[PDB]
Amino acid sequence: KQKILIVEDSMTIRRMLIQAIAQQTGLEIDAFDTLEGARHCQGDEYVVALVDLTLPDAPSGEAVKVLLERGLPVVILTADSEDKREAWLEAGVLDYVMKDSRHSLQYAVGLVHRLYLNQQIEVLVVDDSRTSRHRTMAQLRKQLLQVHEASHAREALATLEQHPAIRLVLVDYYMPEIDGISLVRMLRERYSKQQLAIIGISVSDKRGLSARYLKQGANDFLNQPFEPEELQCRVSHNLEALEQ
Amino acid sequence: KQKILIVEDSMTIRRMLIQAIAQQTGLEIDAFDTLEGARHCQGDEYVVALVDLTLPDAPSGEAVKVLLERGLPVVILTADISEDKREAWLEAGVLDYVMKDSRHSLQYAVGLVHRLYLNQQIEVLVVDDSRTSRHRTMAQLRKQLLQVHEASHAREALATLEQHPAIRLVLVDYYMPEIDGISLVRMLRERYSKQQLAIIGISVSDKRGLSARYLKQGANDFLNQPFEPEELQCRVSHNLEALEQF
Ligand SMILES: [Mg+2]
Ligand SMILES: [Mg+2]
Ligand SMILES: [Mg+2]
Numbered sequence: 056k057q058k059i060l061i062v063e064d065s066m067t068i069r070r071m072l073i074q075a076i077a078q079q080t081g082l083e084i085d086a087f088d089t090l091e092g093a094r095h096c097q098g099d100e101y102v103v104a105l106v107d108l109t110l111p112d113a114p115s116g117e118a119v120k121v122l123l124e125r126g127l128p129v130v131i132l133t134a135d136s137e138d139k140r141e142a143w144l145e146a147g148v149l150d151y152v153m154k155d156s157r158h159s160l161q162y163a164v165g166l167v168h169r170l171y172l173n174q175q176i177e178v179l180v181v182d183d184s185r186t187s188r189h190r191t192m193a194q195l196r197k198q199l200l201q202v203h204e205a206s207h208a209r210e211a212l213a214t215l216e217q218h219p220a221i222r223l224v225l226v227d228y229y230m231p232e233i234d235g236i237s238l239v240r241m242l243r244e245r246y247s248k249q250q251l252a253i254i255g256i257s258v259s260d261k262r263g264l265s266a267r268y269l270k271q272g273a274n275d276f277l278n279q280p281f282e283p284e285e286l287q288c289r290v291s292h293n294l295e296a297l298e299q
Numbered sequence: 300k301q302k303i304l305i306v307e308d309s310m311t312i313r314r315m316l317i318q319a320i321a322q323q324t325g326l327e328i329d330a331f332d333t334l335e336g337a338r339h340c341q342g343d344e345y346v347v348a349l350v351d352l353t354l355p356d357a358p359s360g361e362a363v364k365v366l367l368e369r370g371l372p373v374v375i376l377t378a379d380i381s382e383d384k385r386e387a388w389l390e391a392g393v394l395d396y397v398m399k400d401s402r403h404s405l406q407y408a409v410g411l412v413h414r415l416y417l418n419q420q421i422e423v424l425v426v427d428d429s430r431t432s433r434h435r436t437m438a439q440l441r442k443q444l445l446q447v448h449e450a451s452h453a454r455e456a457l458a459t460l461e462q463h464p465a466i467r468l469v470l471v472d473y474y475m476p477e478i479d480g481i482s483l484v485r486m487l488r489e490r491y492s493k494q495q496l497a498i499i500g501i502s503v504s505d506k507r508g509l510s511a512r513y514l515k516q517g518a519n520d521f522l523n524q525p526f527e528p529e530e531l532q533c534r535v536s537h538n539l540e541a542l543e544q545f
């Protein structure tokens with residue numbers, strides 16, 4: 056999919072977003088001031104929809120559910136707490152962008168650019184805890200990535216053999232048989248930081264596990280527990296490095 | 300300075316380091332197999348020295364202190380590591396260490412020396428209302444060879460930025476009196492884009508979701524407290540590289 060949908064009645068905000076996404080990404084953008092204007096907009100043609108909660112024909116966020124049910128991923132554009140972040144995210148919204156300033160709005164621009172590029176990117180999560188593994192996988196799937204799953208380094212190695220397009224691996228630190236630092240060592244014996252990006256999952260409650268990952272050639276670290284925003288920052292930056 | 304010193308008696312390891320650093324950086328290299336070979340070497344000519352602990356004329360790490368005392372910053376080359384060694388080396392004033400147990404671990408030294416060279420001409424700002432954590436972070440950044448400015452509150456940070464427009468990276472403490480970190484980030488981003496001024500938002504991570512708030516407000520990155528020096532170094536290097544390359 057190559058297009059972005061914007062549903063936002065503010066002329067100023069809609070124009071800011073169109074200009075910025077056009078300049079920075081070159082992606083095709085369809086923008087409407089009402090939910091009704093977007094009635095022909097389908098999941099199969101759009102990467103994501105940036106959706107205002109205050110629409111003239113949907114003034115209390117009704118456009119979110121409508122577009123999600125048509126198969127369009129949704130990012131909410133919002134002016135204003137822990138209860139909203141939760142409720143909308145539980146409803147399956149990918150993310151929210153604050154629209155109280157031009158610079159907060161700019162978050163959406165990098166976001167849609169990343170979502171578009173992620174569609175064709177394969178990543179791998181290696182983690183022996185089903186609970187941590189599935190949480191991370193769900194979060195990466197809301198970044199529109201193709202996500203492979205491994206419960207064990209042995210599985211991860213086999214998955215990499217089978218799927219050479221995988222370009223980023225997230226590696227848990229303690230696992231049966233072959234721990235994370237050992238897996239990083241194995242991978243770096245074969246693959247450079249440009250051929251295969253590795254983010255070591257660590258804890259800052261420790262004798263420098265992050266340092267050990269980096270000294271073995273991991274591109275970066277991410278400390279557990281992490282929030283989706285943190286995961287997105289760290290994954291995006293590493294994917295962007297591979298593209299440059 | 301644009302030269303590095305390597306003192307390493309392993310023919311294999313020394314040659315791997317020379318080849319990689321020569322191919323992947325702009326640094327001139329002087330490399331010797333004994334501490335004596337480096338007798339002429341002066342702190343003012345070299346960015347950093349990569350120093351083996353097992354040298355023929357310094358078989359138990361003696362070259363570290365000798366070279367530090369000559370004013371050369373020192374990164375240790377080590378085949379193994381423990382928590383006691385890391386602590387001892389950092390107390391002694393070593394910048395960092397490089398594992399030399401494989402070819403791919405040596406690669407760490409290459410990215411490091413390239414970064415240490417570039418950092419000499421880069422100005423950064425630490426904003427933190429506690430002198431203790433502020434000075435610790437400043438000391439860690441000064442061991443990355445950065446030019447480090449300090450500010451004890453948002454008001455001073457702004458004044459400093461006005462007075463020093465070359466500052467390209469700001470590290471921001473959230474909890475400060477009068478104007479908190481996120482408020483400072485909002486002010487900065489009303490004037491400066493992510494490419495004009497990188498910001499790493501520092502937070503304790505709890506129910507307030509501070510990292511996310513920083514990110515949504517335009518910070519380039521986050522770093523949660525407590526953090527280790529290597530974590531700080533990694534984040535700073537990544538943000539500096541993004542400014543140069545993205
Ligand atoms: Mg509206
Ligand atoms: Mg585990
Ligand atoms: Mg030796």
Ligand SMILES: [Mg+2]
Nearest residue numbers: 428472474475
């Ligand atoms: Mg404070």
